[PDB]
Design a protein around this motif. Structure first.
Motif, PDB file in Angstrom:
ATOM      1  N   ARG A   1      30.112 -38.758  28.263  1.00 53.19           N
ATOM      2  CA  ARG A   1      31.377 -38.362  27.621  1.00 53.19           C
ATOM      3  C   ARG A   1      31.460 -38.836  26.165  1.00 53.19           C
ATOM      4  NH1 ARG A   1      35.900 -39.398  27.259  1.00 53.19           N
ATOM      5  NH2 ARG A   1      37.775 -38.594  28.268  1.00 53.19           N
TER       6      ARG A   1
ATOM      7  N   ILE B   1      41.433 -28.079  38.827  1.00 51.89           N
ATOM      8  CA  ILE B   1      40.519 -27.423  37.860  1.00 51.89           C
ATOM      9  C   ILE B   1      40.569 -25.872  37.941  1.00 51.89           C
ATOM     10  CG2 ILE B   1      38.363 -27.215  39.218  1.00 51.89           C
ATOM     11  CD1 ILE B   1      36.876 -28.277  36.807  1.00 51.89           C
TER      12      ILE B   1
ATOM     13  N   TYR C   1      33.477 -32.511  38.800  1.00 54.04           N
ATOM     14  CA  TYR C   1      33.264 -31.343  37.953  1.00 54.04           C
ATOM     15  C   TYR C   1      32.943 -31.772  36.541  1.00 54.04           C
ATOM     16  CZ  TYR C   1      35.466 -29.177  41.932  1.00 54.04           C
ATOM     17  OH  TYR C   1      35.810 -28.805  43.210  1.00 54.04           O
TER      18      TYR C   1
ATOM     19  N   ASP D   1      34.536 -32.740  29.550  1.00 56.19           N
ATOM     20  CA  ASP D   1      35.469 -33.377  30.504  1.00 56.19           C
ATOM     21  C   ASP D   1      34.832 -33.548  31.857  1.00 56.19           C
ATOM     22  OD1 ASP D   1      38.216 -34.138  29.535  1.00 56.19           O
ATOM     23  OD2 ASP D   1      38.381 -31.998  29.020  1.00 56.19           O
ATOM     24  N   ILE D   2      35.341 -34.531  32.610  1.00 55.06           N
ATOM     25  CA  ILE D   2      35.012 -34.723  34.026  1.00 55.06           C
ATOM     26  C   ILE D   2      36.285 -34.699  34.878  1.00 55.06           C
ATOM     27  CG2 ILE D   2      33.833 -36.182  35.711  1.00 55.06           C
ATOM     28  CD1 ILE D   2      32.635 -37.682  33.088  1.00 55.06           C
ATOM     29  N   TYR D   3      36.392 -33.748  35.798  1.00 55.31           N
ATOM     30  CA  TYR D   3      37.494 -33.744  36.773  1.00 55.31           C
ATOM     31  C   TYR D   3      37.041 -34.298  38.113  1.00 55.31           C
ATOM     32  CZ  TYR D   3      40.036 -30.677  33.538  1.00 55.31           C
ATOM     33  OH  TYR D   3      40.643 -30.137  32.424  1.00 55.31           O
ATOM     34  N   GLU D   4      38.004 -34.738  38.924  1.00 55.11           N
ATOM     35  CA  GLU D   4      37.751 -35.215  40.298  1.00 55.11           C
ATOM     36  C   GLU D   4      38.813 -34.716  41.255  1.00 55.11           C
ATOM     37  OE1 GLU D   4      37.217 -39.642  38.919  1.00 55.11           O
ATOM     38  OE2 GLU D   4      36.776 -39.556  41.086  1.00 55.11           O
TER      39      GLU D   4
END
Ligand SMILES: Cc1cc(Nc2nc(-c3ccccc3)nc3ccccc23)n[nH]1
Ligand SMILES: Cc1cc(Nc2nc(-c3ccccc3)nc3ccccc23)n[nH]1
Lengths: 278, 277
Positions: free
Chosen positions: A59, A9, A80, A71-74
């Protein structure tokens, strides 16, 4: 349960300033490097399913009056949430600084909320946590849209009954109440006394604060602040009420009394204290 | 180690036909619904390292290497979304070509040199370069080529640690096949083959290599060099006259090369995967 491989990210976004810091998380202003566009990014250590199932639903939510989850980051250690940036400030600060404020302004705000919540309901989502402190303006423009980002709890929840979409319609009635006098309809001595008052759903249009307010507005609120969830208005019903869809909303300035009450009653902000941080 | 929440891959793509089936996986033609763009999606069940390897692949961006566009995961499957190439296998083209020269072979090796040189700059050794994994991007006659035991370098057999030099040896081997249609090392008994590879003993046999330039043979000699420290890098191979100059002959050699291809590469693993079950 679906994912795709992303980059770091930090390679996708430039993290600028921290906006606020919470018990377990932090929100940072982030610039998307490819576009220069700005987002608010909620950073959550994993060390703090269920949240994985919850966040997938967010989402899906796309509406003009609801802050978008883009968005979702991992990573191995963190989640995030890349959220839509809004920069117009908190509802209560705006009303206080406003100069002129009327029933039409309150009804304009409630109409946008009803739209947002009616969309969530059609999508099968109960918010469960609707309250005026999490209503933020999109921008600093005077004519900005409003965005959705214990005394507010519905009687049937207190009564240990299974919650429904009606729970949110109750909360919209409490928000409408506060927008027209600047104080909450139910307020504690003990939390014990407060609980018992919400259960009975006994509240007033009190004098003098309510004397200038239309019968129409008061009727509107009685249909949302209805004890029995089966008698209570849905969002779709409330959006057809003359106060919302017609011309019964008055255009008298009630800013003076409403502002004073907000100053007394909403003098602490969780946004401000997230900012004051650690 | 970094991931994004995605949607069901089947909500983003229409899966069309299976292109081929392996022991452990399946490649299926898929249309991106938003765009109409076609991809080749490798579906691999998790019920059969690879995390690290897949990451590197997503970073590989070159016009002569099949691109990895995206990787999806469900609880049970990985889905590698690949660039679709539709020009078929190198060996089939050559065989159907009608006319074939050193200039054709050199044009093909120039592209592979450029692709492998990029991999090398990026810190990546291929380790498995072979003409059977070279595919044409499209059916057009001037399509570019795309990267998708008797080919392994002497030092690998010598149980020595591999370096990038290994790929350059493989390019020499590919260049050899392209000019005659048969592999430089083959023996029924692989005790003898191992010894030939270990000692890098090969010929320019007659009559097949009679009409080939001394320039081509010199280029292959520098790539098919036994010692990886004396062997040409891709950067050096790319500056050789047969690649960068005009020593590549314009004589048709298709007759002999096609005959030899038909004898030597009659079996295709892409056709086998297609044939399936
Ligand atoms: C959910 C969300 C919050 C925001 N914006 C935001 N959010 C905060 C913020 C303040 C305190 C805790 C968390 C976030 N502060 C801001 C200051 C100046 C401009 C925007 C801003 N955008 N989306
Ligand atoms: C890595 C890759 C393979 C492909 N294309 C492809 N790949 C195959 C194929 C055949 C057998 C096993 C795996 C893939 N078959 C094809 C038939 C007709 C057109 C294209 C095609 N595109 N990218």
């Amino acid at each position: 349960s679906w994912k795709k491989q992303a980059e770091d990210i930090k390679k996708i976004f430039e993290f600028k300033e921290t906006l606020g810091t919470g018990a377990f998380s932090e929100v940072v202003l982030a610039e998307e490097k490819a576009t220069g566009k700005l987002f608010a990014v909620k950073c959550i250590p994993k060390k703090a399913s269920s949240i994985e199932n919850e966040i997938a639903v967010l989402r899906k939510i796309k509406h003009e009056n609801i802050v978008a989850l883009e968005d979702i980051y991992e990573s191995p250690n963190h989640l995030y949430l890349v959220m839509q940036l809004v920069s117009g400030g908190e509802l209560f600060d705006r009303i206080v600084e406003k100069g002129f404020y009327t029933e039409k302004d309150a009804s304009t705000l409630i109409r946008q909320v009803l739209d947002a919540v009616y969309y969530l309901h059609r999508m099968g989502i109960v918010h469960r946590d609707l309250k005026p402190e999490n209503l933020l303006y999109y921008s600093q423009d005077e004519e900005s849209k409003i965005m959705i980002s214990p005394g507010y709890v519905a009687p049937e929840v207190l009564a240990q009954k299974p919650y429904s979409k009606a729970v949110d319609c109750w909360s919209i009635g409490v928000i409408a109440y506060i927008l027209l006098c600047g104080y909450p309809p139910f307020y504690d001595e003990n939390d014990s006394k407060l609980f018992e008052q919400i259960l009975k759903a006994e509240y007033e249009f009190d004098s003098p604060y309510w004397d200038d307010i239309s019968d129409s507005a008061k009727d509107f609120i009685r249909n949302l602040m209805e004890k029995d969830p089966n008698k209570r208005y849905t969002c779709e019903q409330a959006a057809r009420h003359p106060w919302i869809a017609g011309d019964t909303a008055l255009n008298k300035n009630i800013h003076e009394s409403v502002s004073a009450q907000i100053r007394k009653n909403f003098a602490k902000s969780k946004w401000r204290q997230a900012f004051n941080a650690t």
